[PDB]
């Protein structure tokens, strides 16, 4: 047990650096798309068209797990990439402060409000729709950035599955005292491994850097025209309301799948 | 009363022992606490020393506000039980030392008593419960010697303010 | 007819705004791809497959120009977008100082040295080849960003042809005095029109903002993995050695095609 | 001789005429010079005032060194012809005024005598040829008022002897 627990932790550290690698690209291409200009006519329709004409299937392991019907919740209607349609439950209120310290509650509350779009696809769709219709935007460039963003955010959250398996191997005993307890319902234990999986100090650690990146990398240089309104807040919103919760939700589903290892 | 929530297989990683005797010793079980001893009129704790300034490490800012805090600001971090899912963030507590002095300090961070022994925590163990981790201004205001690494204290959230 | 000359000046300034907004998206997309990680197996093959399966044709006006003699010089082999294969002549020497002031010669000399690649496709291909081969990089995300860059750089330089006619409309007296004089060659006119299209003071104006952007936007945030070696050099090299010269080359060709307008 | 390389239809755009007397008159033909008068032992020119610092509208750095220059630094910009294609960048020139004084200054920029009356210039006409555009330090060293704002001067690039 001793050596396998150490080696799993070594793999978790490597997997979390791959996870952190997706931050800057996601932020980069959001800003690249928003600086490019308005939305092209029928841009959403040509984006599903491009996805269908270039259907990138993922890791066999992941695809193996995506028709796991434990993992098929994170399977999307074609041609959209995985996990971009998964809906997290509304966990915050209408007026919750999102990015500023509140006495007695903290900062960066994770999850969705009533008025937040349901999934990353609706969210990225609402941002695109918030832009003005434009005659001069290049359709090929627009559609391709749009496509690139969809594959980036899907690749990001599904690294939660290898991360979960690495966490399980190292923290075997913690998880199986939950997974064996027959007192608790499956959803009642699902909630418990999720509290076991979440680490809000590191969430603040991550969202802090994401906020700094969304501000530094959206800086206006000499004679640049400004970004569309609220580009910075929507970048942070993507991480704080979708990327963080969907990832650990994938992590949780992967742990439940492995109650056969206790 | 309080018991551990789980256990943690230690991992030295690249912990650089010859300068840090506190590294996870690799194959030791470290207890995890989402809990902390009961909060009372004068709750006993271990005062430790820390800087909340930005430096050297990719450490990251404090949890209550997305901020760094200069060593002349009187700020503290509490272990997860006392931190209590940010229920005390921004609160000022009164800390009392055996030399007879006291000081007010703002709760601003968490002393994670669950996570550790991975790359993100310098391969160091979880913080204990029962710890109050304070900036150098708290130690100076209390008249304590910083080279004394840890001292026994009490803390409360009572007011003692009414004139 | 000088209301028309003033009217064209107004759209030249609008066309100039469109051209400058391509800077940030190009720099952002390069940094997104290079922050993602190494190159995927046969992703150079995958990019052409994606271009082939999603062939965006240009606007008709550009399509009509790409099949006349002067415009077909920027026609590329399928499935590459236009102008990414056009080779600029080697105009400066192998030891040229590219990016720091030199007494008696200046700063930011534009053009290709003997050792720089022939065309933007070769250039962006050697940068990709400069990276480690990796087993962890997401192929869909990698390929799509590479695609999105190729459409960005071609759309950028092709705006030279609207810019050219806008300049011609405003400055028709200057260009017609060359386009009618029969003494000279076709090439001798071409050199003359580029001499009148040259504006090195604002190329320095542009390249210096490009330099600042490629440095600020490649800043390393907390615990970030460094970018590959020389990505910041290669960003400015893209503008300084291809985007700027190919654009004025396109807009020179556009003016000669319109010699009957005098 | 030297003669204009072309002409430029004027445009006013959004230019504020109530604060800019010299904006392009809208439809007026402005001459263009890639040339300059011949350079001789003491070349005649019109001295002009300008600042090469940042900190306003959003103009760019100087053409020769991609940098901004303090008003306290003695720097000049030359008409496109004299500028040739950066052949005099970093060169020092001697400038002589009618009051009998002289000064050296460093060439760092071009006074564009071709482009103008578009948005990139503030809808202003091309520079003349025969212009030496100098920082406030050059004016102070010469002892000129800097409210006359153009003076007749001579300039050289010939060397001097020491002991």
Swiss-Prot record, chains A, C:
InterPro entries: Chorismate_II_sf (IPR036263), CM_AroQ_sf_eucaryotic (IPR037039). GO terms for cellular component: extracellular region; host apoplast; host cell cytosol. It catalyses: chorismate = prephenate. Keywords: Allosteric enzyme, Glycoprotein, Host cytoplasm, Isomerase, Secreted, Signal, Virulence. Induction: Expression is specifically up-regulated during biotrophic development. CMU1 is one of the most highly expressed fungal genes during plant colonization. GO terms for molecular function: chorismate mutase activity. GO terms for biological process: aromatic amino acid family biosynthetic process; chorismate metabolic process; effector-mediated suppression of host salicylic acid-mediated innate immune signaling. It is found in: Secreted; Host cytoplasm, Host cytosol. Disruption phenotype: Decreases significantly the amount of tumors produced during host maize infection. Its main location: secreted. Glycans are attached at residues 132, 181. Residues 90-113 are annotated as: KWL1-binding extensive loop region (ELR). The keyword Mitochondrion does not apply. Its EC number is 5.4.99.5. The keyword Transit peptide does not apply. Contrary to classical chorismate mutases, CMU1 is not subject to allosteric regulation by tryptophan and tyrosine. Activity is decreased in a non-competitive and allosteric manner by the binding of the host defense kiwellin KWL1 which probably blocks substrate access to the active site of CMU1. Secreted chorismate mutase that is one component of a cocktail of effectors shaping the host metabolome and acting as virulence factors. The enzyme is taken up by plant cells, can spread to neighboring cells where it affects the biosynthesis of the plant immune signal salicylic acid by channelling chorismate into the phenylpropanoid pathway. Interferes with the activity of host cytosolic chorismate mutase CM2 through heterodimerization. The extensive loop region (ELR) is specific for fungal secreted chorismate mutases and is required for the interaction with the host defense kiwellin KWL1. Homodimer. Forms a heterodimer with the host cytosolic chorismate mutase CM2. Interacts with the host kiwellin KWL1 which acts as a defense protein that protects maize from infection. This is Secreted chorismate mutase. It comes from Mycosarcoma maydis (Corn smut fungus). The gene is CMU1.
């Amino acid at each position: 047990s001793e050596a396998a627990e150490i080696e799993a932790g070594d793999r978790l550290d490597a997997l979390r650096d791959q996870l952190q690698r997706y931050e800057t690209p996601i932020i980069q291409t959001i800003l690249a798309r928003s600086a490019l200009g308005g939305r092209a006519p029928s841009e959403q329709d040509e984006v599903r068209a491009a996805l269908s004409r270039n259907a990138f299937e993922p890791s066999e392991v992941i695809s193996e797990w995506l028709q796991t019907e434990s993992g098929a919740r994170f399977r999307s209607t074609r041609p959209l990439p995985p996990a971009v349609e998964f809906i997290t439950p509304v966990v915050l209120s209408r007026d919750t402060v999102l990015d500023k310290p509140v006495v007695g509650k903290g900062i960066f509350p994770i999850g969705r409000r009533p008025q937040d779009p349901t999934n990353m696809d609706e969210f990225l769709d609402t941002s695109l729709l918030s832009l003005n219709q434009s005659s001069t935007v290049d359709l090929a460039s627009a559609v391709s950035l749009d496509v690139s963003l969809l594959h980036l955010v899907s690749a990001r959250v599904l690294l939660g599955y290898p991360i979960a398996l690495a966490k399980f191997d190292w923290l075997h005993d913690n998880f199986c005292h939950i997974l064996t307890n027959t007192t608790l319902s499956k959803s009642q234990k699902l909630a418990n491994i999720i509290q076991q999986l979440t680490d809000h100090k590191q969430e603040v650690n991550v969202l802090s850097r994401v906020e700094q990146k969304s501000k530094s990398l959206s800086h206006l240089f000499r004679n640049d025209i400004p970004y569309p309104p609220h580009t910075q807040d929507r970048i942070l919103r993507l991480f704080q309301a979708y990327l963080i919760p969907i990832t650990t939700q994938i992590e949780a589903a992967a742990i439940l799948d492995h109650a056969n290892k206790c | 009363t309080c018991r551990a929530s789980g256990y943690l297989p230690g991992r030295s990683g690249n912990c650089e022992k010859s300068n840090d005797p506190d590294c996870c010793e690799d194959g030791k079980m470290y207890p995890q606490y989402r809990c902390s001893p009961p909060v009372t009129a004068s709750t006993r704790a271990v005062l430790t020393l820390n800087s909340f300034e930005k430096g050297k490490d990719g450490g990251g800012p404090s949890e209550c506000d997305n901020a760094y805090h200069s060593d002349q600001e009187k700020v503290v971090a509490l272990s997860t039980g006392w931190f209590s899912n940010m229920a005390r963030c921004g609160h000022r507590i009164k800390i009392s030392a055996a030399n007879g002095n006291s000081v007010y300090a703002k709760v601003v961070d968490e002393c994670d008593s669950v996570h550790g022994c991975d790359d993100e925590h310098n391969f160091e163990p979880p913080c204990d419960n029962n710890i109050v981790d304070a900036s150098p201004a708290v130690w100076d205001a209390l008249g304590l010697d910083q080279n004394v690494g840890m001292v026994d204290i009490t803390w409360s959230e009572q007011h003692h303010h009414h004139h």
